[PDB]
Design a protein around this ligand. Structure first.
Ligand code: HEM
Ligand SMILES: CC(=O)[C@@]1(O)CC[C@H]2[C@@H]3CC=C4C[C@@H](O)CC[C@]4(C)[C@H]3CC[C@@]21C
Length: 463
């Protein structure tokens, strides 16, 4: 009796369980690195930090490419911009300029911009005293203005419906960009009839039309004696072309990525820490104690307070470990014939870092499935530590995040201002938010409500 012919084999079931975790599970069988082939494309998944730091750092330039995806093409306006552009003159140029712009708010100091919008955020939420609300949108508004000031030196006022329009096409872009992660085993979208690409083009069209109208209005405003924002930095470079790479679409797409990344990432991480704090009241209680002691109510928190508020800075680290924004980063591509752990990797191969596997490695983390911000503190709780090298929430090397400083500062200040001023409790109904998560291009959390009430200690300190 003979064996059946085999036309295809996948090591696990599609769309059953999270991809990043199904891949992780395979390591028990095949080791920390292995490959899968879909027609001609070969994809390599790396799930150990040593191999990962070879791919991202030690051989950064070799693997600095991006694979091409049909969905990403629409969003990146055919591989322009930064995040989804292939390695090349255009990618490198815009990344540099973008990084350069952040210099223009170094001691309109970035810390002062952020706290400005947080103050407005906290006054809004104070009116909701005693009510249970979703805080998604108010935070969305806060960070949107920050990124807008950096890009245009403009900010939207409360109730500007352009804010709701932006919220609408961002949710639509994220929803259709990918069912789960950007890492699909099976290219379902080229197989069955679907409106996926149609829908995406419509959300993206609206977004693009909105970014063109800001550009056309700003060409009148642009003056070379003033370089104060990202859009100035980019138009200046165009005019110093005595050029193909600084076309209107190249600039537009780049702003697109920055606007997108600066909002959806930080909002999602803010929602994640609160979710974790409702589930872990002991940690939250100690956070109140901490901030009461080292900051009090004489003033509002500042970047200098990271030195004193260690349990908070540690909490944020633990959330980025447990629920990374990109649990498989963005996929990488081999620009040349190269190797990994002395295994051959041909040019054009897709390389995916399983960051989830790095952050949940039993041999690198104690009880890695548990929320324990303490793990990033010494036993005394007197200074921060780095208990594992297997930790890359922001990536590493040529393709590493470029908003990490901004990112880290926003999260710290938002969480500090809120804890100073607000009791944040479970709503009158007994539900807690599910921590299971939703894997999109971003690792999202199901929307949930939190009862917000102004702190008694905040009121009294006004008398
Ligand atoms: C908690 C917040 C954030 C996290 C965890 C995060 C994480 C990451 C990761 C993992 C990558 C790429 C990984 C890789 O491909 O190796 C990335 C890329 C990138 N991020 Fe962030 N990010 C955050 C916030 C931001 C912010 C605030 C900005 C503001 C501009 C930003 C802009 C970008 C850009 C433009 C890239 C792509 C750069 C390139 O491909 O060369 N991100 N981020
Ligand atoms: C976390 C991360 O890798 C990123 O920050 C890099 C590029 C970000 C990307 C940039 C642009 C957009 C368009 C926006 O309307 C939706 C969010 C999205 C997809 C950002 C998601 C986070 C990305 C991938």
């Amino acid at each position: 009796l003979l064996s059946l012919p085999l036309v295809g084999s996948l090591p696990f079931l599609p769309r059953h369980g999270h991809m990043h975790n199904n891949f992780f599970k395979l390591q028990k069988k095949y080791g920390p690195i292995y490959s899968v082939r879909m027609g001609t494309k070969t994809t390599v998944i790396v799930g150990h930090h040593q191999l990962a730091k070879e791919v991202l750092i030690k051989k950064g330039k070799d693997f600095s490419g991006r694979p091409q995806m049909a969905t990403l093409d629409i969003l990146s306006n055919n591989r322009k911009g930064i995040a989804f552009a292939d390695s090349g003159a255009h990618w490198q140029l815009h990344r540099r300029l973008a990084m350069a712009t952040f210099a223009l708010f170094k001691d309109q100091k970035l810390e002062k911009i952020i706290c400005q919008e947080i103050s407005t955020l906290c006054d809004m939420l104070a009116t909701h005293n005693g009510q249970s609300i979703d805080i998604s949108f108010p935070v969305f508004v806060a960070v949107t203005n920050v990124i807008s000031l950096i890009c245009f030196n403009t900010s939207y006022k409360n109730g500007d419906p352009e804010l709701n329009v932006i919220q609408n096409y961002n949710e639509g872009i994220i929803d259709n960009l990918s069912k789960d992660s950007l890492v699909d085993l099976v290219p379902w979208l080229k197989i069955f009839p679907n409106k996926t690409l149609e829908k995406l083009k419509s959300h993206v069209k609206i977004r693009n039309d909105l970014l063109n109208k800001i550009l056309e209005n700003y060409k009148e405003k642009f003056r070379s004696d003033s370089i104060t924002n990202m859009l100035d930095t980019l138009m200046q470079a165009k005019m110093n072309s005595d050029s193909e790479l600084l076309s209107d679409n190249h600039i537009l797409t780049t702003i697109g990525d920055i606007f997108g990344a600066g909002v959806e990432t930080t909002t999602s991480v803010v929602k994640w820490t609160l979710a974790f704090l409702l589930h872990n009241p002991q940690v939250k209680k100690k956070l109140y104690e901490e901030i009461d002691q080292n900051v009090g109510f004489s003033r509002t928190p500042t970047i200098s307070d990271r030195n004193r508020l260690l349990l908070l800075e540690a909490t944020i680290r633990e959330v980025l470990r447990l629920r990374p924004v990109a649990p498989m980063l963005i996929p990488h591509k081999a620009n040349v014939d190269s190797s990994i752990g002395e295994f051959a990797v041909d040019k054009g191969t897709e390389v995916i870092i399983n960051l989830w596997a790095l952050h949940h490695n039993e041999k690198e983390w104690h009880q890695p499935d548990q929320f324990m911000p303490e793990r990033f503190l010494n036993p005394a709780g007197t200074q921060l530590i780095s208990p594992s090298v297997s930790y890359l929430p922001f990536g590493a090397g040529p393709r590493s995040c470029i908003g990490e400083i901004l990112a880290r500062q926003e999260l710290f200040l938002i969480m500090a201002w809120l804890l100073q001023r607000f009791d944040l409790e479970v709503p009158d109904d007994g539900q807690l938010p599910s921590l299971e998560g939703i894997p999109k291009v971003v690792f999202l959390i199901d929307s949930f409500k939190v009862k917000i009430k102004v702190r008694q200690a905040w009121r009294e300190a006004q008398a």
